[PDB]
Design a protein around this ligand. Structure first.
Ligand code: ZN
Ligand code: ZN
Ligand code: ZN
Ligand code: ZN
Ligand code: ZN
Ligand code: ZN
Ligand code: ZN
Lengths: 131, 150, 139, 109, 282
């Protein structure tokens, strides 16, 4: 009863309990990508890797770096802010290359339906120049 | 009425004569637009100021926000795009979208052109793929991450 | 006059994920495809309706039981129904429920024997679905 | 021979009813770990009923193997009430164990 | 989907894409025709002509690597095509073998953009087509087929079908940085026409070597390094010459290609006797 009170998992599964989950999940994810269901293979691989990290890279290699400038007042806070809603950006950003201005995901998907230029007004046609 | 004063003084002030009253009216109208949550109107006002700030030659005289962020590639530690599906300097492979396994491409905006690089977990998906994946989930799709991006 | 070159083939076949066998034949050339979905254990129709993460742990197996029942699958439907019955919880906490869940003779024995049975049927879809259901309900 | 089939069908039907009642009383005293046992037993009897109506190793969800495994888990756990109740209700139709062990369990209860 | 008179001469190989929406048919006419076979319509796209001889095998690359298609022909040069903006175009040429090249097959996407080249000079080559190939003497008198082992995990093995009455198994070795020989199987009295490795590995591994002497061996491997058990697909002899064997994507369903324009389906029982499943002809 104490040990049942001392855990939150429904089951105490181990590697020997499910011996070959990895190969079966991997092959069914490949068969899912053969079909037109690319979200479900991500779901099943996420379940597999969650358990794998529980009992124990091509998706990396690019990281964003903020431009370092010596600022003192409002502009140090406003250097890392969105250029459409004027709030801080910390998750799910959008970065242009010709001009180095951030945007939110929802802010970009709202602004580019009714926009042509950068919302900060630097004169960059970001739909054609983010490369 | 600061609205008409700003929207009229933007036609000639940064182009011809620097005066603080126009700057005060512009800042007041932009803060009022932010307070009204009229972000679309604020962005239209900013791009209209940048359109009407060009001189006869074409030099933009309005003050713009400085550049903020740029994208590295962790191998040669340089910018991957100059102001292909490979880094143009070290030749490394760009990370792919976790939904469709298509890499980044360097050299009206559609929702299937630009990556959405989250600045917390640094994992990039296309815009439409990321919207479709986060419309029914709240976890980053790459293995070994725990970050609710959207 | 020294090259080992075989006689060219006049026909062949190609397999797709939906079970259609793409065959090209000689006497002009004729390329045909015939439906052979009955000979394949893994079905794409079942994968579109499964929901193994966006519900309760009993909800996954009940939804899969209804899905397998609606496509005239019997043994898989009863397996999902039994696994639904073995994965029932409540708002109140009873430690004996966790004790019975963690026993080697319950739940885990069912997963092991279902894996052993479905290996001989070559049903990779059911193996991976059982693994992801029994690993998503781990929490 | 059809009369024996009809008798077996009625036996499965009122055994389903008895299993439902035993699950109802367990759910009444709010014990889920033994409520689930009788739900499994009822579903296995429903499986056997539909297989009789519609008419290598055994699957784990078979109506005999699941009942025998639940009985073995009960007699390893020590739940006397359930391991004797299964021996009353499912002995003649489904051979669980030896007759000597079953009669000894009834006598000990 | 009925496609009549796709080529003016004998057709040799028709391989579907990764999504089963495009069909690439190559023949002896030095022509490879691409069709959009989505739904029931099979409208042609291009009539690409780049080969100087008859074209033997084609294989679609993974869409993770883009829309790339491989093609080998009699001339000994491997031609690689990339479809950009709806325009099929040549990219790279691989011509190392002196004799004719018979079989070409892309590796699965976990291995990278590797292309497997097996020619009729008794040698095989492994190439990486990005943006130093490894040359291995596979067999003595000739090699007719070469196939990849599927990647079960996130150990690179490939099987070679030679004309030396042998089925050879090859495994990567990091000591010599070459694909070294791991096992040899003898089950045929003639040249092995085709070898196929099953894409799904459950319980035991699978293989399928068909040959022109009207016999077929379904080699199975239970353990990770155990001996490959040999069994016959059928007790009798095949009515005509066997050409190709193509495994099903799911399960173990084998489609054969006899010389009499007949495709025969084979499915395994619980015991292991390969009962025939169906027949496709004309
Ligand atoms: Zn914003
Ligand atoms: Zn900008
Ligand atoms: Zn820009
Ligand atoms: Zn670089
Ligand atoms: Zn993508
Ligand atoms: Zn992440
Ligand atoms: Zn994130």
């Amino acid at each position: 009863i104490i040990e049942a009170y001392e855990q939150e998992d429904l089951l105490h599964l181990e590697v020997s309990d499910i011996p070959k989950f990895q190969t079966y999940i991997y092959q069914y994810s490949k068969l899912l990508f053969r079909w037109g269901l690319p979200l479900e293979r991500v779901k099943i691989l996420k379940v597999s890797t969650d358990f794998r990290s529980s009992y124990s890279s091509p998706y990396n290699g690019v990281l964003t770096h903020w431009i370092e400038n010596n600022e003192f007042g409002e502009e140090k806070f406003l250097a890392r802010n969105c250029n459409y809603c004027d709030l801080r950006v910390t998750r799910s950003s959008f970065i242009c290359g010709n001009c180095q201005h951030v945007l939110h995901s929802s802010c970009a998907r709202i602004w580019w339906e009714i926009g042509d230029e950068c919302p900060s007004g630097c004169g960059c046609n970001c739909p054609e120049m983010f490369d | 009425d600061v609205q008409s004063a700003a929207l009229i003084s933007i036609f000639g002030s940064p182009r011809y004569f620097r005066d603080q009253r126009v700057d005060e009216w512009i800042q007041t109208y932009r803060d009022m637009l932010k307070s009204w949550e009229l972000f679309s109107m604020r962005a239209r006002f900013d791009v209209l100021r940048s359109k009407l700030s060009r001189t006869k030659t074409g030099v933009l005289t309005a003050d713009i926000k400085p550049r903020q962020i740029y994208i590295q590639c962790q191998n040669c530690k340089q910018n991957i795009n100059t102001p292909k599906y490979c880094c143009p300097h070290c030749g490394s492979s760009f990370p792919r979208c976790a939904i469709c396994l298509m890499p980044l491409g360097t050299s009206k905006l559609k929702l299937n052109e630009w990556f959405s690089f989250c600045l917390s977990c640094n994992h990039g998906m296309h815009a439409g793929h990321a919207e479709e994946w986060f419309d029914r989930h709240n976890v980053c799709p790459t293995p070994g991450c725990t970050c609710q991006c959207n | 006059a020294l090259d080992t070159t075989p006689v060219p083939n006049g026909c062949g076949s190609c397999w797709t994920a939906t079970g259609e066998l793409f065959c090209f034949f000689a006497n002009k050339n004729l390329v045909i495809s015939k439906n052979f979905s009955s000979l394949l254990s893994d079905r794409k129709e079942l994968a579109l309706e499964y929901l193994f993460m966006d519900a309760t742990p009993e909800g996954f197996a009940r939804n899969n039981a209804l899905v397998a029942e609606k496509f005239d699958l019997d043994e898989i439907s009863h397996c999902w129904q039994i696994l639904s019955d073995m994965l029932i919880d409540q708002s109140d906490y009873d430690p004996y429920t966790t004790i019975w869940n963690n026993h080697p003779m319950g739940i885990k024995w069912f997963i092991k024997e279902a894996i052993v049975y479905f290996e001989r049927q070559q049903n990779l879809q059911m193996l991976a679905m059982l693994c992801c259901v029994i690993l998503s309900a781990r929490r | 021979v059809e009369a024996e089939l009809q008798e077996k069908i009625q036996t499965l039907v009122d055994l389903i009813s008895i299993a439902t009642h035993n699950a109802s009383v367990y759910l009444s005293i709010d014990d889920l770990t033994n409520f689930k046992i009788w739900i499994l037993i009822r579903d296995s009897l429903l499986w056997d009923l539909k297989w009789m109506t519609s008419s290598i190793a055994d699957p784990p969800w078979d109506t005999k193997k699941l009942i025998k495994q639940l009985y073995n888990q009960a007699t390893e756990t020590g739940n006397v009430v359930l391991t004797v109740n299964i021996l009353f209700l499912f002995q003649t139709i489904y051979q669980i164990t030896e007759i000597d062990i079953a009669k000894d369990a009834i006598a000990h209860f | 989907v009925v496609i009549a008179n796709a080529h003016n001469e004998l057709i040799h190989d028709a391989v579907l894409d990764y999504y089963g929406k495009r069909l690439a048919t190559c023949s002896s006419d030095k022509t490879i025709k691409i069709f959009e076979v989505e739904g029931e319509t099979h409208k042609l796209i291009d009539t690409l002509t780049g080969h100087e001889g008859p074209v033997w095998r084609v294989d679609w690359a993974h869409p993770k690597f883009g829309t790339i298609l491989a093609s080998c022909s009699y001339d000994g040069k491997v031609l690689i095509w990339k479809e950009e903006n709806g325009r099929w175009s040549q990219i790279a040429v691989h011509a190392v073998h002196s004799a004719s090249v018979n079989s070409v097959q892309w590796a699965p996407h976990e291995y990278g953009p590797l292309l497997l080249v097996a020619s009729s000079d008794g040698k095989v080559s492994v190439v990486e087509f990005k943006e130093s190939p490894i040359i291995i003497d596979a067999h003595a008198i000739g090699v007719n087929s070469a196939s990849w082992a599927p990647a079960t995990i996130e150990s690179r093995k490939f099987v070679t079908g030679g004309a030396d009455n042998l089925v050879k198994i090859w495994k990567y070795n990091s000591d010599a940085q070459t694909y070294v020989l791991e096992s040899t199987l003898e089950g045929h009295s003639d040249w092995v026409r085709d070898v196929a490795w099953s894409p799904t590995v459950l319980l035991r591994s699978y293989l399928a070597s068909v040959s022109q002497d009207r016999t077929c061996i379904i080699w199975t491997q239970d353990n990770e390094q155990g001996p490959w058990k040999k069994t016959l697909l059928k007790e009798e002899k095949f009515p005509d010459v066997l050409w190709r064997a193509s495994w099903s994507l799911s399960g173990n369903v084998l489609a054969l290609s006899g010389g009499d324009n007949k495709v025969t389906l084979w499915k395994e029982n619980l015991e292991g006797k390969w009962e025939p499943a169906g027949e496709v002809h004309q």
